Design an enzyme around this catalytic site. Structure first.
Site, PDB file in Angstrom:
ATOM      1  N   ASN A 101       1.380  -3.915   0.382  1.00  0.00           N
ATOM      2  CA  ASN A 101       1.335  -3.119  -0.842  1.00  0.00           C
ATOM      3  C   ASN A 101       0.028  -2.364  -0.964  1.00  0.00           C
ATOM      4  OD1 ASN A 101       3.923  -4.098  -1.826  1.00  0.00           O
ATOM      5  ND2 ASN A 101       2.866  -5.980  -2.034  1.00  0.00           N
ATOM      6  N   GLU A 135      15.550  -6.287   0.356  1.00  0.00           N
ATOM      7  CA  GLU A 135      14.171  -6.682   0.576  1.00  0.00           C
ATOM      8  C   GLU A 135      13.811  -6.737   2.040  1.00  0.00           C
ATOM      9  OE1 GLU A 135      11.912  -6.511  -1.532  1.00  0.00           O
ATOM     10  OE2 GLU A 135      12.684  -6.956  -3.535  1.00  0.00           O
ATOM     11  N   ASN A 183       5.407 -12.091  -2.856  1.00  0.00           N
ATOM     12  CA  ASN A 183       4.171 -11.340  -2.897  1.00  0.00           C
ATOM     13  C   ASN A 183       3.004 -12.320  -3.022  1.00  0.00           C
ATOM     14  OD1 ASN A 183       2.103  -9.775  -4.837  1.00  0.00           O
ATOM     15  ND2 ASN A 183       2.796  -8.651  -3.135  1.00  0.00           N
ATOM     16  N   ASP A 206       3.965  -8.670   0.930  1.00  0.00           N
ATOM     17  CA  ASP A 206       5.276  -9.325   0.658  1.00  0.00           C
ATOM     18  C   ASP A 206       5.789  -9.944   1.990  1.00  0.00           C
ATOM     19  OD1 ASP A 206       5.220  -8.093  -1.916  1.00  0.00           O
ATOM     20  OD2 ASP A 206       6.230  -6.368  -1.035  1.00  0.00           O
ATOM     21  N   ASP A 236      -1.995  -2.363  -3.351  1.00  0.00           N
ATOM     22  CA  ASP A 236      -3.029  -3.138  -3.983  1.00  0.00           C
ATOM     23  C   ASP A 236      -3.697  -4.121  -2.992  1.00  0.00           C
ATOM     24  OD1 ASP A 236      -1.179  -5.165  -3.805  1.00  0.00           O
ATOM     25  OD2 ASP A 236      -1.299  -5.766  -5.868  1.00  0.00           O
ATOM     26  N   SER A 241      -2.123  -6.662  -1.532  1.00  0.00           N
ATOM     27  CA  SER A 241      -1.244  -7.800  -1.417  1.00  0.00           C
ATOM     28  C   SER A 241      -0.167  -7.533  -0.348  1.00  0.00           C
ATOM     29  CB  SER A 241      -0.654  -8.188  -2.780  1.00  0.00           C
ATOM     30  OG  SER A 241       0.323  -7.254  -3.178  1.00  0.00           O
TER      31      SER A 241
END
Ligand SMILES: [Cl-]
Ligand SMILES: [Cl-]
Ligand SMILES: [Cl-]
Ligand SMILES: [Cl-]
Ligand SMILES: [Cl-]
Ligand code: NA
Length: 129
Positions: A46, A35, A59, A52, A48, A50
């Site tokens: 991301n 990660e 997220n 992380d 969309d 969003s």
């Protein structure tokens, strides 16, 4: 902060992640590795909209508030910034909520694709725990 491997294993263990929801420590270390490369300041945007955050790339769609993810929740009741701290407490507490939510560690796509079913104990080998 960029943790060492055994350093992070030790902090995760201290905060009660070793065998949390049945996931051995090496699972959590492996997930962190893929990660964030053990970097608490890691961020990833991301498609969309969003983002992380942190060592476990939590997220903003569900779990933390960043003020810039329309329609999102903050189920960990934290600013996403808290997930970038050198202190992993917020990340760990929030991870515990996530992994309890029914899909276990499959919530972390990198865990499913790179850790699941591998020799995850290798991630804690040699560590004084
Ligand atoms: Cl393990
Ligand atoms: Cl928001
Ligand atoms: Cl810590
Ligand atoms: Cl808990
Ligand atoms: Cl499970
Ligand atoms: Na959010």
């Amino acid at each position: 902060k960029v943790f060492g491997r055994c350093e992070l294993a030790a902090a995760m263990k201290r905060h009660g992640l070793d065998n949390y929801r049945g996931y051995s420590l090496g699972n959590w270390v492996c997930a962190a590795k893929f990660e964030s490369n053990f970097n608490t300041q890691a961020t990833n945007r991301n498609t969309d909209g969003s983002t992380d955050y942190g060592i476990l790339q939590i997220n903003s769609r569900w779990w933390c508030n960043d003020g810039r993810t329309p329609g999102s929740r903050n189920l960990c009741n934290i600013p996403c910034s808290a997930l970038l701290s050198s202190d992993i407490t917020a990340s760990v507490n929030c991870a515990k909520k996530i992994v309890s939510d029914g899909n276990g560690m499959n919530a972390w796509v990198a865990w499913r694709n790179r850790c699941k079913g591998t020799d995850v104990q290798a991630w804690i080998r040699g560590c004084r725990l």
